[PDB]
Amino acid sequence: YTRTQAQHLFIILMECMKKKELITVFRMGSEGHQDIDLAILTALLKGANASAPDQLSLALAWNRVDIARSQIFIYGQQWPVGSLEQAMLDALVLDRVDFVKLLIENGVSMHRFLTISRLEELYNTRHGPSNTLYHLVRDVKKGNLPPDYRISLIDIGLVIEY
Amino acid sequence: ISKHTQLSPTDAFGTIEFQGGGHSNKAMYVRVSFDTKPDLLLHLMTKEWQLELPKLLISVHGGLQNFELQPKLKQVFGKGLIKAAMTTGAWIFTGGVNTGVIRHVGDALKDHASKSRGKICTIGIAPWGIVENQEDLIGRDVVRPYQTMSNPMSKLTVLNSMHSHFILADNGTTGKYGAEVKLRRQLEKHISLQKINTRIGQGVPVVALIVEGGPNVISIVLEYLRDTPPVPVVVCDGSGRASDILAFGHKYSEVTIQKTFTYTRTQAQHLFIILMECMKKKELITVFRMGSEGHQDIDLAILTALLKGANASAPDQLSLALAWNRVDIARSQIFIYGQQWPV
């Protein structure tokens, strides 16, 4: 393949094998990683060299519930304080019902997560599908709505009553 | 100190709600001293909690540390245990805390609850000093919230959910185990002598299930074997702990050079006397294999170990199989060639 044993790329190959903590090999019918998509995605969680909240955020953004259920939520992960609450809030904003169910199953409870501030933040999101709530708030207030208006829970009460 | 405590009255009983995982489960609980007579315990379990007397009792033992099982073994363990405890009206005694084999029992109960009806009376006898929150449960006779999330830095183990009832025993100490073994054994011994509704004169049959384990599991299985009513035990091979050691030692009934495990104080300290006595009482041990031998289902392996362990006649086996409402067991293990029923 090359100029005999005189010319070789063995130094480059040895350096790559020195950095072998990142290489992932896909083998058909092997012990693990039976599919390419699993092999590609599972090589980014460990390759990020980041914390468990970062892996959870990546799996939430990708909308891959199975990856987080199998490669993230494992025994002994050492979640910091206030991390699963932020993950639940971000999953609630993005309309990821599967991740909400998985987080509820894995410890978090709505009786402690949901406060007044977090609900009022949930009512003022720009992610997810479109809605007609802003038109309702405008119509309840009979117009005269200034731009960049924060929606308070009193407005929600008024629109529910209407 | 030499156990210099104060005999104050109880201040923690009622019902607890498990905020956390995706289930709405209630769990009655009390807090009593570890020197309590079994008579009032059974009175409380029969009258206050309204539990009918079981036709079978399964005492589950194991190692008090987290481990892992192969995915093939979990399917043939959890489903079989749930089937055996559900088809036959039975009680399951467990540690109660969320460690080791008890977590496997908990997830086995979780998997069953999403596809079948009925409730399984799982009773946990846990020490009071190891729960995550000794507080938040002081409200007597009132529903108390409980959080399933636990931080590993707290040095305490959270109470396992999916348990029907709890019996908490405190010796006055916190952070150490060993406050419940005597009470659990005394209650099991007393309930073994309790008379079943059949008027033949037999008590409820008690069985022992061993998963994983440690150095003390050989001592407790010897205590089971040496008891005046012999209590059969059932062990599993795929765990890898001393249960696997006992399963390997079941072969070659009475190779002492295989004593090196990096598990005890070298070859100087051994439990080989206890192991040899357990193998001396070999006729009661039952080993479960994943298809290597007969009885590939642990629901049958548990039930078939009580018929021969009773050391009774064919009418008693027939009465037990009739009370359990298991027609297949009586058809296959009782009604066999040459049984010689009396007149």
HEC secondary structure over A21-88: CCCCCCCCCCCCCCCHHHHHHHHHHCCCCCCHHHHHHHHHHHCCHHHHHHHHCCCCCCCCCCHHHHHH
Q: CA–CA separation, B114 vs A107, rounded Å?
A: 18
Q: CA–CA separation, B181 vs B93, rounded Å?
A: 12
Other C-beta atoms closer than 10 Å to the C-beta of B252 total 8
Which residues does residue B33 pair with via DSSP β-bridges, in sequence order? B170
Residue in B30, B24, B87, B92 with CA at minimum distance from that of residue B58: B92
Experimental determination approach used: cryo-EM
Q: CA–CA separation, B25 vs B21, rounded Å?
A: 10
A84: chain B residues, CB-CB within 8 Å: 149
Q: Are residues A107 and B21, on separate chains, in Cβ contact within 8 Å?
A: yes
Query: After which residues does chain B break, using C–N > 2.5 Å?
Result: 254
Name the residue facing B22 among A76, A84, A104 (closest C-beta). Answer: A104
CA B254 to chain centre: 29
B151: chain A residues, CB-CB within 8 Å: 81
The resolution of the experimental structure, rounded to one decimal in Å, is 3.2
B19: chain A residues, CB-CB within 8 Å: 109, 111-112
Q: CA–CA separation, B162 vs B27, rounded Å?
A: 8
CA B332 to chain centre: 26
The nearest CA of chain A is from the CA of B141 a distance in Å of 22
State the Cα angle at B216 between B100 and B274, rounded to 5°.
140
Q: Are residues B21 and A104, on separate chains, in Cβ contact within 8 Å?
A: yes
Interface probe for A, chosen from B147, B153, B154 (most Cβ of A below 10 Å), is: B147
Q: What is the dihedral of CA B273, B275, B281, B285, to 10 degrees?
A: 170
Residue in B326, B282, B281, B333 with CA at minimum distance from that of residue B307: B333
Q: For residue B27, give both structure tokens.
A: 């769990």
CA A61 to chain centre: 4
B33 phi and psi angles, rounded to 5 deg: -75, 160
Interface probe for A, chosen from B149, B150, B153, B162 (most Cβ of A below 10 Å), is: B149
Name the residue facing B19 among A81, A84, A111 (closest C-beta). Answer: A111
**Are the C-beta atoms of residues B175 and B129 closer than 8 Å to each other?**
yes
